[PDB]
Structure formats: C-alpha cells, structure tokens
Write a protein that binds this ligand. Structure first.
Ligand code: PMR
Ligand code: ADP
Ligand code: ADP
Ligand code: SF4
Ligand code: SF4
Ligand code: K
Ligand code: MG
Ligand code: MG
Lengths: 417, 488, 268, 267
C-alpha cells in the first residue's frame, strides 16, 4: 500500500504483490455459450489447456466448443514454422467441427511472451476461407488480462467486423443473460427507442452495425478497449453508472433516454411501476443485509458497482473494495454514487489482504474459489465472486435477485446453525 | 503444435503441487504468471479442502518482464519461508516461467536458508502431471535420505510403507483406508503413508519399514526403486484393485515379508457376478481407457471377474505402455497408446462398445456416441471425490466397482422387453428407465439392422459391412446381415 | 510514405551508430523522422539527444501501466535537427523478457499511430534476434537494411537475418533494401556473398576513428569537426544512403545460403 | 574444473577470444571444454574447422528424449584435443533462444560435463536479454568481459557487471577481469576500471590476422607465424591462459549508474 489518492470523497489505494485471480482465457467459459456458433482455440501450453477444462469440463460435451494448440519443443526451438503449424491445426479442427462459423485464436502467456503473431495468422486463415469461417484473435494471457478483461479482448476483435451504418441505434455492450437482454429491449422499446441491439450477439455471424448515430450503453465495467474501439468507428459512448440495482439501472436507462431526447414524463411513467415493485421485492433481503460488514477481493471490476448497490440499496457497510484494475474515467459516475470514505484498493497483495480480512472478520467476504472454502474453515462467511458473471443481475427488475446472491450464504449460515 | 480438445494430464507442476499439498510441513514456491493460481481450485473445490495449498506463486505480470523477475522470485522465497516456516522447500517453475529461465531453484539454494531445498527441474513442454509428481516425490526423498528378517528377530508385527496415494489421485482417500484395514486383519502394521499425510520428518522413517507397498506406480515406482537400491527395501508390484488382484497382492506381500498363509468371499463381487441376474452380463462389449494402473486393473476385472468382452483397450501413461500392450495381447487386441482425445474417441466409435470404462474425458465421447459410461480413472472432476466411502482397492473396492460399472447398463427385464417389442410409446429404443428420463445398404438390409436391439447394433453394422467386403458381396441386404451373424 | 526502415545486423556492427546518423541525414534532407530503439540497453538514440531519455516502460511505470491515461508524446523526445527519439527499454541483463518488452512496445507504437504523421520511421534493433519479439519491427517496415563488415561472423549473421526477412515476407510487405558495409576497408567477402544471394551494397563505411569518437562525444558525425580525419567522407556517405532510400531503393529478391554453403563460400 | 563464462558487447570478439583461449589452455596441457550458447552456433568452428551438430538438433533427433543421449552424441573433439559443444537455437526471430540455451546448460550439467575436465569455457552471446543466457553463471567460477576502447562496449560491459554482481549474491561466480580487444589503446577502459574496481587481464589490438583466422576457419595458432601479428596474438592468448591458472583473483567491483558512465566516458 502506497500513499493514498482521493476522488469523489472516496479513497483510492494501490497494492503490489502476489495475486489470486483468473487469466483472461477464462472468458471462454461464458463466451462459448453466449455465441454457440463460435469456437475458442487457445494457443499456449498444457497449463492453459488444463485451466479451461478444469473450469468447464465438469460439464459433458458431445461436441467440443474450445481447445488448445499446445506448443511443443520444436515450436520453442523454432524447428517448426509457427504459421505452418497453426494452419495445420486449424485445418484438422475444422474437420472435427465443420460447422464452426467463427474461430477465436486466443493468446496465452506462452504465445504472448515469445510473440507468435496470432493476429496475422488469423488474417491469413480468414483469407483462405472467407466465405465460411471467420478467424479472429484476442489475448487472454494472465500477464496481460485478468478474468473478465478477456471478454474486452474478444469484443474488441469483433468490432472491425461490425457493418458500417449511420442509423438510429442503441447498442448494449457487454454480456447480458438472454432474459435480461430481452427485458431491457422491451423497456427501451416502451420509451420509443425502436432500434436496440446487443454486443456480443447470440450468433457470431450476425454482428450489429455501427457508426455515427449509434449510442452505446456499457452494461459491463470491463470494456475499456472495446468502448475505445467502438468510439473510433463513430459511435457515441454514453457515460452512466452500471445497471446494477434500482439506482444504477435507473440512471443507466436515463442516460440513453436523455441522449435520444425522450420526454421525462414518459420515462417516469414507464420506470415507476418497475421501481416501486423492486423496492417491495428488495425488503426481505435488505433486512438480512443491512448493517452487515462487507469485504470484496479483486476479481472482475464488478466490485465497485456491487459495493455501491449493496451499501446504497441494501445498507451494507463496506470495509474494503478491491479491484484488479481501475479505469477512473469509466468508473466516474459510479464513484459519485459510492458512500463517502469508501476504501478502494487497486491491485493486491493476497497475503496482506488476507490479514486485513482476518483482522476485521467481515460478515461477508466476496472472494475467489481459491479462498472461499479455506475462509469458511476459519469461521468467515463468504460469497464466491465468480457467480455475478454467471447470474442475471442487470436491470431494475433484477435488483432483488442480485441482493439474494449475497443474502443466500448468510441465510444458509443460519439454516445450518 | 498439438491440437488438444481435452488433455488427459495437466502440466508437470500440478503433479508437484499434488505432492506438496498431500504432505504437511512442505511448502512450494512456484514461479508463474498471474492466473496460474487456478490450481488452488483443484484442491479447494474438487478436493473440497478447507485450507489453502502450501504454494506461493510469484504471479508476475507483463510489466514485470521489463524488470527483475529473478529478484521477484527471491523475495517470494524469503516471504514464504518466514511466514510459513516449513520443514522443507520445493522450488519450481510453471510453463511460462520456464521460458524466461530465472533458475529459481538454484537461486533458493544460494539464499542461506537452513532447511532442505528441492530444486525441481520439470520440463512443462515434454513431461506431464504424473511424471511431475513422481519426479518431485523422488527428488524429495532422494534429497532427504541420500547420506544414509528383522521383524521376526525383534518380536514385532511386520510394518509396511504405503507409497503412492495423493490428492487429485483417484479415490486415494478410501483406498488407503481399505488397504490399511486389510493389512491389519492380516497382521501387518503401517509404518509411513506417503505422500498423503506425511511430513518430511515422516519420510525420514521410510527405511524403517519391512517392505514398501506401491499402490500407485505412476506416482511412486521411481521412489520404491530408489528405496530398494539404497536401503534394500523390497516392494510389491501387484496393485490390489479387483478381487483376484487383491489376493495376488496379499500373496506377494506375504512372500516379501516371509509369512505363511485372503479368502475370495470377503468381497461381495464374486457372488453378485455369479448370481443369475449377472448372466446377461456375459459378453457385453467394453472399451477401457485411463492411466496404466487402473486400465490394467479394469482389464482383468472385466475379463476374469465380470465376464465382459474387452473390445478396446488403451492408456495415456506411456511409461506403462509395454504392460498395457502385453495385457492387450492376451485379450487379442492392439493397445491404444495415446494422449490424443480424438484418437480415443475414434477408437471407441470404431469398435462400438456397449460400455466405456474410461476417464472424465470418455464421458464426452460416450455422450456423443450414446454409450453407457463409467469413470475408472483420472482425469476426473468433483463427482468422483464423493463424501461416502468409495475405494477401488481391496474387498470393498470391488463392491463399489461392481455397483458402478454395472449401473450404466440397461437392466435385465427392460433389455429383454425392448428386444421383444419395439412399438411402445414410452419404452422406446435406447431408453433406460432406471435412469429416470423420458458399401450401400438396401431398404431391405437396413430393416434387418433396425431389428438389432440398440447398443449391439453398432457392432452388427460394422461386422456386416466387414463381411460384405470380405466376400464378393455388393450392396447389402437382410440375408447378408444374417449371413454375417452366422459368420462371426 | 511513411517509409519504415528496420535496421538489423551482427551484434556491435554499428547498427545504432548508423541509424542515428542516418536519421540525421534524412532530417538534413528535409524529411521528418522518428527513430525507435528496440534494445533493453536503450543506447540507440543518445547521440541524437546528447542524453539518455526515459524509456517506454519508464513512462508506463509513471502511469502505473494504465492505457487510458497514457500520453503519446511523453515517451517521444526531440533530438538533432528535430528528429524524434523513442527507446523501448527493457529488463536488466539476465532476467525478465526483453523480447516481449520490445514486441509489445512496437504494437503500442503502432496502435497510437506513431508510425504515421512522419516521413521516416527507423527501427534500430539489437544484434541477437533470439525470439519473435525482436522481429516485431519487421511486421511494419517497408524495407530492412542489414549492416555487416568484411569478415566471416558478420556476414554469417547477415545470412541468418536474410532468412528471417524472407520468412516475414511471406506474410508482410517488408523487403530487403540492401547491405550497409561498415568498419571495413574492402568488400571482397561481402560482394562474394552478395553475388550468390542477390543482395546489393547500398553504402560503404571504412573503419573511421572519428565515428568511434562521435559516440563518445554523444553527437552525430554531423556535429564533429569537419577538418578531423575522415569526417567528410562519412558525412557524405550517410547523406548518400539517405538519398538512396528516398530516390533509388528497390525490393531485392534474395535467397539465403545454408550454413554449410556460406561456410564453403567465405574464405580464401 | 575451472569454469569460465565469457560475456560482452555483441560482436566484440567473444567467440574469437574464447576459441583461441581454449586452444591456449590446451597448449598448456589442460583439458578443455568449450560451450557455445548462441542460436548462431558459431562459437567453436575455428576449433573444428566445421559446423558441429547442435544440442537442440541432436535432441530433436531423439524426439527430445534426453535420456537416450550420451556425451559422445553432442560433444566433438577439435584442435589439440579441445572438446566442443554448440547449444544451437531457433532461426532469427523465432521461438525462444533463452529457453533453448537454458535447456542445453542443464543437459550438460546432467552428464557431469562441467566436472570431468580441467577448464570449461561458456561462450555466450552479446545481448543477455533474459535469464536463459545467464544460465551459465550458476556453474561458473569466473566471468571474463570482453570490450573495446569505446563507449558502447564499455557501457554494455557495465550492464553485464551489474548482472554478475546480482548473481554473485547467491552463486560462487566472480568477476575475473576485463579482456581488452580490437583496440590500440586503453584510455576509456582504465577510466572505467579505476572507478569500478575491475582490472584488465589481457589486451588484443586490431589485428587483421585475427579477422583472417575466422575466415580460414582456424585458430590463431594455426596461422602462419610470419604473417603480421600472429606470434604476438598467440603469446597474448598464452599469457591470458597462464593468468587464469596462477594469477586470477575474484574482483570486488560495483557498476556505475547510467548517468555516471554516460558522463565518465568521453573527452
Ligand atoms: C414378483 C416377483 C419377482 C421379483 C422379486 C423379480 C426380480 C427380478 N427379476 Mg423378474 N422378478 C419377479 C417376477 C417376474 N420377473 C419376470 C421376468 C423377468 C425377466 C425377463 C428378467 C427378470 C429379471 C429380474 C431381476 C434382475 C434385475 C434386472 O436386471 O431386472 C430381479 C432382481 C432380469 C434378470 O436378470 O433375471 C435373472 C431379467 O432379465 N424378470 C416375470 C415374467 C412374467 C415375473 C412374474
Ligand atoms: N564505421 C565505423 N568506424 C569505426 N568504428 C565504428 C564504425 N561503426 C561503429 N563503430 C564502433 O562500433 C561501436 C558499436 O556501435 P553500435 O552502434 O553500438 O553497434 P550496434 O548498435 O550494432 O551494437 C561504436 O561504439 C563505434 O565506436
Ligand atoms: N583482435 C581483433 N582484431 C581484429 N578483428 C577482430 C579481433 N577480435 C575480433 N575481431 C573480428 O570481430 C568479428 C566478431 O567476432 P566474434 O567472435 O563473432 O564476436 P562475438 O562472439 O562477440 O560476436 C570476427 O569475425 C573478427 O573478424
Ligand atoms: S494464459 Fe498464462 S495464466 Fe492463463 S493458464 Fe495459460 S500460462 Fe496460466
Ligand atoms: S528468448 Fe526472447 S522470448 Fe524467450 S525469454 Fe528471452 S527475451 Fe523472452
Ligand atoms: K502430447
Ligand atoms: Mg545498437
Ligand atoms: Mg560469439
């Protein structure tokens, strides 16, 4: 921990040391299901291969959806041409899965350290097919990306393939659950916004068009590069907090309505029943969560909006809000909503951070699954952090469900004892 | 490069981590990039442990590559020893760290630490998990004991070491329990169980045993060999999985100890398999795959204890290759020695078995091919680390094996009824209700093929086409399918 | 336009010396030029600035490696006659990964459009191209120039680099621009190699002590005393090379020789 | 076994010096093993008059199963009995030369090749851009640094000194001294030496017979004695070898900061 900085009444610290997070390769676990017509081929080692199947291999696959081109000794010794090897591997893969429409060559620590030019390989491979299979590249390496940053890489790679258009369009960027996607679209249509599309899409071949006149709402806080690339193609990136809970979702929706100049009386008549019902639904969880001390370890960059929601709407007390990365301009609107004197730590020293957890003994510690069960054995209740990336947590109507995710382990603690 | 949809083993450092975590008082400094800490979940989620693995990762980032990554690992070695105060220290690299070559192991030995240091040289691009664990286990013991009949004369019970069991091993938790129980009933004490549960101090007691029991050769064969050369300690080579195998194992250990005289009915498998409801199990076609030890064990059980016909067999353990080939030869088969999932899938598809006895990865191919499957070996996931007592070894292990290997098969009455009547609205073709879920062929030829009762239809189609090629037959018809049947 | 040149060659052959003076030559010819040092030693451009400017990873460290906060001209520094200077930097000797650092630096400079809005970009790469990271400039260059001496080990190194250029040419626009003879009185071995490979000599520098002295004085050859021995010939030669790259340069069809072939080729 | 690692600015004459030094040791009746740690694999050809197969190529022949290899498979006899090994490495701009070199050093250590001989010379490349090319340092007793009387080589030497000092914290390796090469005078070098604590162990001038010897694929000892400079250079190599046996001492040296050496050198 170094000298503190101060922004929006809140404290920003930075810590260096041992980290316990996922590399960006793990983005495949959710991305392969958002876009089933895509395949994710990692170029790396057996470690990378082992990572993905230790994650997703608990499920049984009739058809493979991901894989690893494992670097061999000859590759490292430069005795085999990397580009010839990639071509041969991609060749025999499309034999086993001839229905692949989009192939992602995902960079790893090994491929990025020795700098295999996967991007050019992707270009050349795309050329050799071009009517059938699109081949793209993004890095999911641990040395470069943390967890959800992998999605930022994947979406950024799709951006150049988005059709060019100057049409009216509200673009929702970031992985949404299917029913959440449909719900937000329905609401947006009630406001008079007829063109609402999602990025990423459900099919890799059907990318939304982009250009000037496209307003972009960022549903996920980890789309730094994707947002920048969307802006480079003419789209306007709306600034707003993230659609978590009533407060965040309301302002997020208002941002788009303001940009489309929708009359305030209409957006109020539309959002009012949703908000009132949400406040009603939230009550039993607030009862469970109010006054509870919360401590979040860095994982996904969801920690700041989650902390904002759990304190403002559920009445939890924040001990420490850890993030693996902090885009201050992007978290701007979110930092303004946070309660005063919030302690935010960018980076991590897991051992020292653990000491801070142990000395405080929080009511609920949001942490990874490398620390969850060990903390439980120490009599410290946890909420495994990964769940929020795999749950329908966005929108006014999902506020109570989001709160339930944190109320659940506390509730279970009571039931069992 | 090697296209790998599923890897049968992890990189070798996982094997090293398995040794350090299975033990106590042994810490592990791993030079690795940020993100390799996923390995912790293998122990906290799959093995469901309530403690962090004794592993300190340097977790370097890209920004660190522009700096002193060697100083980075030195600092973590200091911190780890100071904070955790272990009896001995493992120092090693991950695949990525192996590229930048910081020599972290030799560095550790030059830092003035006053505890034993094992410098691990694991080639992540040439070797795999089990080799990693065996190498780590070997070097640690070689390092601890390098500088350095009777039980009859002392007037004490014979005592053996149990070498091999480990976390992320297959049912090691209960195999140890079962074997320890059986040995005690045979009047044989346990000296040291390692690596699982052992400290470096315990490892010092390894020569004190009258014999070494090598339960998991993939992990402990190199060590038993080293212990034999240096301390004259003999070691068993029969792994006690299966009724007959457990009997042979008992007879073997008795010889090495010099005792005299294990009954068969101590397991319930012999009676269950002898009973009449197992009559229809005779000749059911099974494919077998996994690590060497469990494949060899399963092969004898399927062939000599259950009455299955092994139609395919293989292993990913290349160090076990010659033994699997010998076993395959007895079975009249050619052994599939590979780590290529697509080759395994293909081999299963080609011989079209009624049952697959493989790893977690074989569930993938069995699902696609619609074949009843059961897991007999690592790689595994959380389902195969159950709460209940679930050994594979000894008398009770054979009981578990009987239940689990027969379970995926359609049951007797239902299988007979589907062979009799094919026009049901609920009990259709390929339906198994006990799981609680709702070159050219002529039109004449395929009609006789649909008559074949499901799971054996695959082999029938193969044999008929092989028959039609084997003769001057062109097309195929209903009669040539019946001809093929009488031919084989 | 922009003309992107990558300078490779045997270690210590004089790649940094040549690149710096060549940049100075372009600037005197009116062109605006950026020079980029691709070496952990960051000793490429110091004769242009009379100073050792902070490196790319230095600027990144000040910003805690936050991309969104990064300022473009913060790692660029003005030198002789307006020449812009950038050093990639790298780890200390014997650790880290200079290859990743250099390669990632190149990509960082490409994405920020630094290889545009200037007339001449010159990549000055280290001697031992031990990995893909140090071949990164070849992914953007129009021409590669190889510096060599009139001896075995220099020419043998040039041959290995020629093979690298040909491999890169299969997927990128980069082509061989020619050979720069340096620290040599004659060219008999060089032109022998040129004859079989199809390479051409673009410039010839003798072993000049004023050049050695100029590096010690942290200045270009153009800032040395003209009346000092050899200074005039050297200055003219750098200008001639710059003019050749503006007016005459052509993609050379070249095939490297096998190790055993160049072994039997060179000698007496 | 006296283990020596040769480092220095690229193209300063590390391979030229090493091979001739190995020859000099052998003329003194010492058994010598020279190891080329460079993808160029151009360290020992003057000792063998040819390109010897590289360790990485030999490994590739046995599909990287190193246990099938013996010293006779990758070690070759050259001038006057000197044994030679080339690590080999990837083509320029491919793979990871550091990894490869790291693996080679380990194979040699496995076969006790750093023990069963009198003198061992690691000839390493110029750009020590990663740990793989610092791998010989764990086994070396001394490190010699080759430089010329000019800014860039001395500056490069300064970086290497900092690296040697670091490793010396945990390894037995020590600075053995400086080899002045390809220079008529020593003014800038001794300016650096006095302020760092290093000393010059040998001096070789710019001699064309030396350039010619690389082209003739032979050692300076096989050159014609009546050719200018040949005898002088032979005697300087003999002297340096004599020093490493009888006179060599671990030097206490501290490198300069970038700003310091920048201002120290010059006029
Ligand atoms: C009503 C008494 C009774 C019991 C306890 C069983 C158990 C059983 N009956 Mg069945 N069975 C009973 C009755 C009948 N069975 C019948 C038929 C039958 C068949 C074809 C089969 C079978 C079977 C069984 C079995 C073995 C478990 C199984 O695979 O279903 C039990 C425990 C099964 C087998 O393997 O028999 C040897 C098999 O193929 N039963 C019929 C024909 C009308 C009757 C009345
Ligand atoms: N034409 C030349 N004549 C004399 N000395 C030269 C010449 N070119 C280079 N040198 C010397 O070579 C040394 C190293 O040059 P440098 O640019 O560092 O090579 P590289 O960049 O290839 O390592 C310089 O200090 C300089 O004294
Ligand atoms: N003392 C010297 N006099 C003249 N030329 C030399 C001298 N030392 C080295 N050289 C020349 O320098 C070239 C580079 O030699 P080399 O051993 O490859 O250096 P390094 O191994 O440091 O790259 C040789 O081809 C040789 O011609
Ligand atoms: S990309 Fe890096 S951090 Fe991720 S699994 Fe591979 S080696 Fe580990
Ligand atoms: S050879 Fe290149 S890629 Fe490999 S560790 Fe060294 S600098 Fe990095
Ligand atoms: K393999
Ligand atoms: Mg240079
Ligand atoms: Mg050399």
């Amino acid at each position: 921990l170094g000298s503190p900085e101060f922004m929006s009444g809140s404290t920003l610290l930075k810590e260096t040391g041992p980290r316990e997070v996922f590399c960006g390769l793990t983005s495949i676990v959710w991305l392969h299901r958002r876009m089933p017509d895509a395949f994710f081929l990692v170029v790396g080692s057996r470690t990378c291969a082992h990572l993905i199947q230790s994650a997703a291999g608990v499920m049984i696959f009739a058809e493979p959806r991901f894989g690893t081109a494992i670097l061999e000794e000859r590759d490292l010794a430069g005795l085999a041409d990397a580009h010839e090897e990639l071509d041969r591997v991609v060749k025999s893969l499309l034999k086993r899965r001839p229905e692949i429409r989009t192939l992602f060559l995902v960079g790893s620590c090994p491929s990025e350290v020795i700098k295999i030019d996967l991007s050019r390989a992707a270009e050349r491979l795309s050329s050799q097919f071009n009517g059938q299979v699109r081949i793209l590249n993004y890095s999911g390496s641990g040395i470069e990306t943390t967890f959800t940053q992998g999605e930022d890489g994947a979406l950024k790679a799709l951006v150049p393939l988005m059709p060019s258009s100057q049409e009216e369009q509200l673009l929702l960027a970031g992985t949404l659950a299917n029913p959440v996607e449909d719900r937000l679209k329905t609401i947006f249509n009630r406001l008079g916004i007829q063109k609402v599309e999602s990025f990423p899409p459900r099919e890799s071949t059907k990318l939304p068009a982009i250009g000037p006149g496209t307003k972009v709402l960022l549903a996920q806080p980890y789309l730094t590069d994707t947002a920048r690339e969307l802006k480079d193609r003419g789209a306007e990136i709306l600034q707003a907090p993230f659609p978590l809970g009533v407060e965040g979702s309301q302002l997020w929706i208002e941002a788009a309505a303001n940009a489309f100049k929708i009359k305030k009386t209409l957006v109020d008549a539309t959002l009012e029943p949703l908000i009132t019902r949400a406040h009603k639904a939230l009550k039993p969880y607030v009862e469970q969560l109010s006054g509870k001390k919360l401590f979040l370890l860095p994982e996904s960059q969801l920690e700041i909006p989650l902390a904002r929601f759990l304190s403002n709407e559920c009445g939890m007390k924040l001990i420490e809000v850890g993030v693996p990365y902090l885009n201050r301009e992007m978290m701007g609107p979110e930092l303004d909503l946070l309660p005063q004197n919030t302690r935010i730590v960018e980076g991590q020293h897991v051992e020292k951070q653990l000491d801070r957890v142990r000395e405080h003994h929080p009511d609920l510690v949001v942490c990874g699954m490398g620390l969850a069960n060990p903390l439980e054995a120490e009599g410290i209740s946890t909420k495994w952090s990964i769940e929020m990336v795999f749950s329908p947590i966005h929108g006014i109507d999902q506020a109570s469900d989001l709160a339930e995710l944190f109320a659940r382990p506390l509730h279970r603690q009571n039931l069992l004892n | 490069m090697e296209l790998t949809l599923w890897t049968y083993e992890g990189p070798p450092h996982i094997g090293a981590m398995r040794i350090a975590t299975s033990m106590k008082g042994l810490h592990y400094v791993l030079h690795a990039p940020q993100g390799d800490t996923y390995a912790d979940l293998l122990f906290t989620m799959i093995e469901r442990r309530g403690s962090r693995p004794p592993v300190t990762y340097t977790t370097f980032q890209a920004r660190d590559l522009g700096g002193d990554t060697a100083e980075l690992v030195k600092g973590h070695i200091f911190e780890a020893v100071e904070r955790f105060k272990p009896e001995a220290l493992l120092v090693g690299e991950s695949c990525t760290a192996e590229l930048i070559q910081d020599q972290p192991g030799s560095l550790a030995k030059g830092m003035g630490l006053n505890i034993p240091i094992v410098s691990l040289e694991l080639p992540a691009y040439s070797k795999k998990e089990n080799w990693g664990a065996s190498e780590t286990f070997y070097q640690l013991i070689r390092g601890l004991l390098k500088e350095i009949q009777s039980w009859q004369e002392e007037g004490r019970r014979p005592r053996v070491n149990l070498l091999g069991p480990s976390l992320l091993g297959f049912r090691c938790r209960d195999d140890v329990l079962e074997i320890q129980k059986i040995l005690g009933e045979n009047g044989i004490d346990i000296n040291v169980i390692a690596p699982l549960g052992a400290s470096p101090s315990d490892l010092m007691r390894l020569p004190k045993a009258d014999a070494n029991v090598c339960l998991y050769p993939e992990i402990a064969e190199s060590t038993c060999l080293w212990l034999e050369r240096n301390f004259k300690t003999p070691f068993t080579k029969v792994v006690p999985i299966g009724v007959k195998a457990t009997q042979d194992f008992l007879e073997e250990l008795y010889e090495l100890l010099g005792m005299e005289v294990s009954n068969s009915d101590q397991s319930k498998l012999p009676w269950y398999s002898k009973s009449v409801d197992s009559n229809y199990l005779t000749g059911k076609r099974v494919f077998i795959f996994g690590d060497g030890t469990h494949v060899l064990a399963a092969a004898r059980i399927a062939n000599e204890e259950l009455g299955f016909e092994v139609v395919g067999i293989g292993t990913y353990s290349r160090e076990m290759a010659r033994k699997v080939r010998a076993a395959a030869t007895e079975l009249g088969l050619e052994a599939l020695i590979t780590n290529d999932y697509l080759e395994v899938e293909e081999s299963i598809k080609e011989c079209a078995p009624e049952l697959v006895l493989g790893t977690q990865m074989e569930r993938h191919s069995a699902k696609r091919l619609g074949i009843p499957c059961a897991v007999i070996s690592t790689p595994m996931h959380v389902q195969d680390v159950p709460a209940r007592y679930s050994p594979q070894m000894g008398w009770e292990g054979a009981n578990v094996i009987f239940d689990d290997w027969v379970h995926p098969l359609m049951m007797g009455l239902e299988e007979h009824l589907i062979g009799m009547f094919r026009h049901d609205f609920e009990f259709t073709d390929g339906h198994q209700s006990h799981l609680g879920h709702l070159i050219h062929w002529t039109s004449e030829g395929e009609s006789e093929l649909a008559k074949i009762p499901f799971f054996v239809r695959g082999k029938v189609r193969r044999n008929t086409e092989k028959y039609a090629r084997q003769a001057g037959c062109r097309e195929i018809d209903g009669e040539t399918l019946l001809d093929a049947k009488a031919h084989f | 336009g922009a003309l992107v040149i990558a300078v490779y060659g045997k270690g210590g052959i004089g790649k940094s010396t040549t690149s710096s003076n060549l940049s100075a030559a372009f600037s005197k010819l009116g062109k605006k030029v950026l020079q980029i040092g691709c070496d952990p030693k960051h000793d490429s451009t110091f004769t242009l600035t009379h100073k050792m400017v902070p490196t790319v990873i230095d600027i990144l460290e000040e910003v805690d490696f936050h991309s969104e906060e990064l300022r473009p001209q913060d790692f660029m520094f003005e030198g002789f006659n307006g020449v812009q200077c950038v050093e990639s930097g790298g780890p200390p000797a014997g650790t880290g990964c200079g290859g990743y650092v250099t390669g990632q630096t190149v990509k960082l400079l490409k994405e920020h459009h630094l290889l545009e809005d200037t007339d001449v970009v010159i990549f000055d790469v280290l001697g031992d191209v031990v990995c893909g990271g140090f071949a990164a400039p070849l992914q953007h260059a129009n021409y590669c120039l190889i510096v060599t001496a009139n001896d075995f080990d220099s020419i043998f190194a040039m041959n290995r680099i020629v093979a690298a250029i040909n491999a890169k040419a299969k997927n990128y626009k980069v082509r061989l621009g020619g050979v720069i003879a340096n620290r040599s009185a004659e060219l008999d071995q060089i032109e022998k190699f040129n004859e079989k490979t199809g390479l051409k000599t673009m410039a010839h520098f003798r072993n000049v002590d004023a050049i050695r002295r100029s590096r010690l004085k942290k200045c270009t050859i153009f800032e040395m005393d003209p009346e000092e021995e050899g200074v005039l010939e050297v200055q003219n030669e750098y200008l001639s090379l710059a003019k050749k790259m503006i007016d005459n340069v052509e993609p050379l069809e070249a095939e490297p020789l096998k190790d055993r072939e160049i072994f039997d080729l060179l000698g007496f």
